[PDB]
Amino acid sequence: ANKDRDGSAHPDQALEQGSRLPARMRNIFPAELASNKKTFVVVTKASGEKSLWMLDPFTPIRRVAISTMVQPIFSYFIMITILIHCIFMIMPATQTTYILELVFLSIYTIEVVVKVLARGFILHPFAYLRDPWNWLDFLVTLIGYITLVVDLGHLYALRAFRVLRSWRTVTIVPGWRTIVDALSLSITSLKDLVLLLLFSLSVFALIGLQLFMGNLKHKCVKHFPADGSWGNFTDERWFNYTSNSSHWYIPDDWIEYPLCGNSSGAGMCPPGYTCLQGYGGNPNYGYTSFDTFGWAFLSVFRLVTLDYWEDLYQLALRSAGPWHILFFIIVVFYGTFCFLNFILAVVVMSYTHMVKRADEEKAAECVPWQKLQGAIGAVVLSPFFELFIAVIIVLNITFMALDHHDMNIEFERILRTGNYIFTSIYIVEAVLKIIALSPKFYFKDSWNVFDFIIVVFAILELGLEGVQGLSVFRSFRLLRVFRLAKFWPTLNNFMSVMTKSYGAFVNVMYVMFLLLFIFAIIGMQLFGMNYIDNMERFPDGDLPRWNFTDFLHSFMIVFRALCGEWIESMWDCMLVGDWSCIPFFVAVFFVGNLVILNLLIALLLNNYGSVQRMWSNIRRVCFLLAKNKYFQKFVTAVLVITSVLLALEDIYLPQRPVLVNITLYVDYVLTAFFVIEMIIMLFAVGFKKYFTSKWYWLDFIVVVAYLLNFVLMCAGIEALQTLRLLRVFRLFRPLSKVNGMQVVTSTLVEAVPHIFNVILVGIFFWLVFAIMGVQLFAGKFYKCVDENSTVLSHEITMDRNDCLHENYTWENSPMNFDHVGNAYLSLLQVATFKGWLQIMNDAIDSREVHKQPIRETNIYMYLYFIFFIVFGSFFILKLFVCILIDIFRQQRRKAEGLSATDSRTQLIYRRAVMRTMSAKPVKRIPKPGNKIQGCIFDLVTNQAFDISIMVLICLNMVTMMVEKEGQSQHMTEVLYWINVVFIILFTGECVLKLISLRHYYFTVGWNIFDFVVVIISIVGMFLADLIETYFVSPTLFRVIRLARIGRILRLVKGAKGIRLLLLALRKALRTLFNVSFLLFVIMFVYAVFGMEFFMHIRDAGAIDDVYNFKTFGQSIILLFQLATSAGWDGVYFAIANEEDCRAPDHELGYPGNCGSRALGIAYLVSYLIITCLVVINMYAAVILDYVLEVYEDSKEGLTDDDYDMFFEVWQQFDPEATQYIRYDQLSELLEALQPPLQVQKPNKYKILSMNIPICKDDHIFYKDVLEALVKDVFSRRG
């Protein structure tokens, strides 16, 4: 439609496009319309469409107006002034800077007056401004105006929103258009799933409001008033007593009250108190309870977004009882592992659709001197020397990464002389290679300059510390390590593929930093002041470590909200300002993580992807038995049933004295069974085809283990435990043959060799960061602490000597940077966002060795963790997902037939043509037997009845959103008697529909679901009499009624996008189930191996007599939490303690009570890889592969709807029985369909065109017509 404006409609005015001004006019003042400097613009082609048809350029001021409109320097002047304006904005206040702000305000007004006067009188300021840049540059300056003629008139909440001028600068760095519009399209498409997200959060909050209505208030109160002192009343004064807070139970120096509950297996708080309900107070200042709708919405959004959820988990389970985890699973599997990936799918799709246009457009275009020169040349490029220098730089990397903290003098001199030797050989062989060849081709390789640079640095480091320069170049000494890039092929490829496609990364990083800069300034101006005026509602009257007071702290808190954690800062904000802290943080999370970080993942994904007789007879008979189905079912069943029994080996096994005997008998018969079946199959398959096979080696290892364990009776030594648990692993062999677990195991076992390569590259980069973290922080982190765990401030203990003066102990903090090992550990803590606060605090405060740290100095050393986290967590750990998506796609394809040589486009046509086998039509039987009884259906099928019902659903869903704890007595009865009206109306309506069309009621799924739901409602309304004849317990009446919630999810019916996404989710369910199955078997293995190592532990950190490893149930209660790497710092600090232990005695009542450290490090770091990074991402891979396919099927091919909405015609366009037509109505049949499968009425020549085989005289079968239409629409669109 470009010719429309390139025509007599409303002509152009002028253009520049690089040094030529061809003006367009009213055609009666023609000048420069050719298309000598201009006919080269043709050559330049071999832009400002002004749209000013309002009035005339008659050489008024409008001339110079246009002349300055498009100009090389105007926009540049504006942009430089914006940059300097914001860099003044960064510093809070200054006297008389006010008048400067007046200049910076009045530049923009001349900028807008010229840009407007050059474009009309008033009329087109109504038509053409639809480009939003002008909207921005207009609204913000009008805000600047209104702020200046009110004189601080109690409105400082909008003087901040001027900073979003600076977005205008995103267009200064090249290659910026193919990213911005990507965000635009992603938002414009993400709307559709926003709707479903909203509805689903709502129904989950409604479910949670029923099960947990006001039990997070439970407290522990002393038994009775007393027998004595408090009096004699034992009546209403009782209520005066049990409300005086000062005898609720707080252990010591806490500020939260522990929760009790009195179900089975939770709380039971002291002996001497009792667990009372409903005495004021909620955890976290009163922002957590489920006791009304809004707070339930907040907590369920907190669960879905997967942020600091271990707190709510532990609270809810402490209160109600462990079975309640059957709730959390449902909101995690559906909301976080299966819904927050619809967003990833949408963003990836939009980005890969916007990159294609751009890239296709780009792709559419002394003589012995030289004698010994040859000699040394022979002795330089010889392959000896590359080997030699590679080995020497490896030994250099080794000698530059020891650096203990104390480091005895021998290490000192050793490392010194080593550095000397290494710099010497570097310099000498570099210079002799200089004199070996090419005194000037040398600087012509773009790779040897690096060596000269590092040599210069080594030399100057040798010098200026030989003089009194303190820390001159030992930092740049690190740069050796990157020289190890000529030798690895993997690392060389990883480097090249980024170094020669790099505009995208720069642009994305710039957008990211600019966005959170904008947010930081808005914050510093908006909340700001409230942290100093009030300043005392906090616990101990002092600014928390994270606050909006200076620019730096503000930047940091918005960054911390971007990386994933946004809730623990919302409480503080909302504690000093009543509201307007919720939209801010929810927005900075939503346009933060979920959009930009998903855009980054969408960018690493298209750049990095005679007795012999009976000898033979026995062989034959074992061969015959070994393959019978029943024997295989038997062995599988015996494995499963002897494995499940391995669970109930918990604490107080001895107190059940019969179990020990039965389990010993079981393991005896087990070792017999194993050794027998090995003989059987060993005669069966044959020797040499039994050791080279992978699976059978598992059986060999387990049988040799059971053998070595059995013979340990002649020695009388008791059977060692860790061997008799190797039984679990055989459980992996049958698992691999469930119908639909070929894809998952095949893709894992093919993905492994890439996982390992990425692990290696990550090890390398983290080494580069750690051997610097050591020299920056090693030796600090010490602190002087009293008998308690508190730090003497600054003057009671200035440095170490004073700390040892009066016996104040001199403690160390656990996570520190002494070795290189602890560096890896603490960095793995920083880069998974768990327990990364104490490290940053102690790293901020480190002043200098042997001296007490000050509360906040050395603050600029945040920049270490930011540059580490951008290059170690948004870039590497997000690369594991980008190798399971590709591999899963390839494996599904190559495992469902469908040969892999068809180029991604004819597969759509294939699925379309394949869809044409389930095409049976049908007709509704019209009308019942006699008139009035049948006169009911005549309207039940109408556009104003189901719509007249789908409002009752919404009204009912509102009347369930009012309940709250503390309802006055009258309210509950009116709600009760208002439910019955609906519960009878629904069944009345359903029975009318059913008695209308007498039979045939069950040909649709929705009718079946409605019938089931309504009978469930009508029986649940009665069974609400759970009182007076059955156990009167809250946690059963509170669940039996949930049935009423079923009749509201009927609301999703009818919307087409909210049906397309659900079709996508349903088309991939067996595979998703199988992935969850594998995750649970892994959790079972780890639970069993845990119940043995970590059963007796000293309570510390995060092990609180309800979340220990003692029994099986609590073991899974803990491991389901650790599966998402939520709170592993506490569990690690608890199981890896090795101080005061009371080591076992092996003499009487054998205790444990300390654990260890080796298999503490080796038990978690191998559970944050098998689970947190390799399976939880397979969820995303599967659902992304299915959603992307259903979209690209809808937008181009034929959707699942088109066929049945085609069938609507021919459903009530011909009768039921015969599937035939006689060629006449056929014609205007193509006038009763819809644009996808139809052509307009001039079709008789096309009906002549297509060859639909006329069958019997005048019967036309349908598949012919429909196939013709399918290939016709594929011909028209393509």
Ligand SMILES: C[C@@H]1CC[C@]2(OC1)O[C@@H]1[C@@H](O)[C@H]3[C@H]4CC[C@@H]5C[C@H](O[C@@H]6O[C@H](CO)[C@@H](O[C@@H]7O[C@@H](CO)[C@@H](O)[C@H](O[C@H]8OC[C@@H](O)[C@H](O)[C@@H]8O)[C@@H]7O[C@H]7O[C@@H](CO)[C@H](O)[C@@H](O[C@@H]8O[C@H](CO)[C@H](O)[C@@H](O)[C@@H]8O)[C@@H]7O)[C@H](O)[C@H]6O)[C@@H](O)C[C@]5(C)[C@H]4CC[C@@]3(C)[C@H]1[C@@H]2C
């Ligand atoms: C491939 C990788 C990628 C990642 C990346 O690496 C490569 O890794 C690097 C990361 O790790 C980053 C940082 C590391 C290197 C830089 C370190 C630099 O430290 C500076 O220097 C001091 C650290 O030694 C600190 O300030 C000192 O604080 C005390 C020491 O603990 C004082 O003792 C001292 O004063 C002077 O003592 C004598 C001299 O020998 C010293 O030279 C020093 O100058 C200074 O104090 C000064 O600094 C402030 C805080 O102390 C106060 O304003 C004030 O201090 C007080 O004033 C008194 C007199 O004035 C006296 O000093 C002292 O008693 C008082 O405390 C004073 O002005 C403070 O850290 C800062 O100054 C800091 O800035 C961050 C930095 C730039 C960052 C730039 C480079 C990175 C981003 C990263 C780099 C891309």
Ligand SMILES: *[C@@H]1O[C@H](CO)[C@@H](O)[C@H](O[C@@H]2O[C@H](CO)[C@@H](O)[C@H](O[C@@H]3O[C@H](CO[C@@H]4O[C@H](CO)[C@@H](O)[C@H](O)[C@@H]4O)[C@@H](O)[C@H](O[C@@H]4O[C@H](CO)[C@@H](O)[C@H](O)[C@@H]4O)[C@@H]3O)[C@H]2NC(C)=O)[C@H]1NC(C)=O
């Ligand atoms: C298990 O968890 C339950 C829910 O989570 C929880 O209800 C239950 O807590 C307590 O269990 C004990 C059982 O030992 C039970 O006694 C407690 O309830 C009693 O409530 C009485 C109500 O008195 C009211 O007083 C107000 C004053 O305004 C009045 O208006 C009311 O009409 C009502 O009378 C208390 O009076 C009572 O105190 C006792 O009352 C006895 C009767 O006279 C008397 O003989 C005693 O000496 C004493 O005076 C109890 O508080 C129950 N808590 C509540 C809130 O009901 C918990 N149980 C266990 C075992 O864990």
Ligand SMILES: CC(C)CCC[C@@H](C)[C@H]1CC[C@H]2[C@@H]3CC=C4C[C@@H](OC(=O)CCC(=O)O)CC[C@]4(C)[C@@H]3CC[C@]12C
């Ligand atoms: C996902 C599918 C394919 C696997 C089916 C089993 C699982 C869903 C797991 C995870 C949640 C588990 C349940 C959570 C609740 C309970 C009760 C609890 O066990 C107790 O000891 C309860 C205490 C008591 O009531 O005496 C902890 C484990 C257990 C048995 C369950 C163990 C097995 C479950 C059903």
Ligand SMILES: *[C@@H]1O[C@H](CO)[C@@H](O[C@@H]2O[C@H](CO)[C@@H](O)[C@H](O)[C@H]2NC(C)=O)[C@H](O)[C@H]1NC(C)=O
């Ligand atoms: C328990 O009863 C006592 C007296 O019956 C209450 O003490 C009174 O508390 C009010 C609170 O404002 C004071 O104004 C009165 O002066 C107090 N009485 C006397 C005699 O001084 C006590 O408040 C009751 N318990 C609770 C929790 O309110």
Ligand SMILES: *[C@@H]1O[C@H](CO)[C@@H](O[C@@H]2O[C@H](CO)[C@@H](O)[C@H](O)[C@H]2NC(C)=O)[C@H](O)[C@H]1NC(C)=O
């Ligand atoms: C909660 O109990 C404490 C302890 O009895 C009460 O403290 C008493 O306060 C009154 C005056 O306020 C004194 O006369 C008593 O001597 C105090 N008791 C003791 C043991 O010293 C406290 O007042 C109670 N809470 C409320 C709200 O009254």
Ligand SMILES: *[C@@H]1O[C@H](CO)[C@@H](O)[C@H](O)[C@H]1NC(C)=O
């Ligand atoms: C408590 O009240 C009862 C009510 O009759 C009274 O008999 C009793 O003496 C009172 N308690 C004391 C210690 O006097």
Ligand SMILES: *[C@@H]1O[C@H](CO)[C@@H](O)[C@H](O)[C@H]1NC(C)=O
């Ligand atoms: C630890 O704190 C307590 C207060 O809870 C106080 O007795 C003292 O400061 C410390 N205790 C001891 C025994 O020193």
Ligand SMILES: *[C@@H]1O[C@H](CO)[C@@H](O)[C@H](O)[C@H]1NC(C)=O
């Ligand atoms: C602190 O103790 C060290 C011990 O080596 C000593 O050398 C130093 O002089 C002492 N300084 C002060 C101020 O006590």
